[PDB]
Amino acid sequence: MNGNSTNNEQLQQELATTQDQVASIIESFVELGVSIYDFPGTPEATKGMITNLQRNVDRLYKLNVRSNDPQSSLSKVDIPLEVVQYIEDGRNPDIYTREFVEAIRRSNQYQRGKMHGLKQLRDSLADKIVDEFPELKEPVEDIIKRTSPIDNVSNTH
């Protein structure tokens, strides 16, 4: 757990530095975009937008080498296609976690309802059988105690 904890902490630091590098790239992009739109036509502005491209390229250097260095938890990040194509729709990615865990809970509750319904069918069948058949009451109760074992993975919630 200690290794997992320090992996998560180092991963959070890596995510933060990738985020600030990406923010710097986006700020440089809006800077060179408004430089293009507000171009004075001077060679100095030409060198300035060349310089903007230079900082963008070296930022790309720094976050590509950090995408391949051995000390990287970015390889350990698990990313599906649904979240990245979900973002490309322009629609909020935390809904994907929200709807995803809601699907988890919905399926869990569907299974729990089916679980309780099977229990109701079982014990109604058992009571009805031992009402009709008194000679079979001992095998029915044996089946009940066999098919309702002591809870060791159900006491925890």
Added chain:
Amino acid sequence: YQYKIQELRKLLKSLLLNYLELIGVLSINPDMYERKVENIRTILVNIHHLLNEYRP
């Protein structure tokens, strides 16, 4: 055929009890039913073969 009649009676009681056991298995762990379905199959084919033995 009295022996076979009592065998059929025990077979049908075992079929009912094994269906109850199958419901119990599915109402704790719906993965161990596979051999229980095989047990129900054996009970059914024994019942049907007992009937066809009684058929002459």
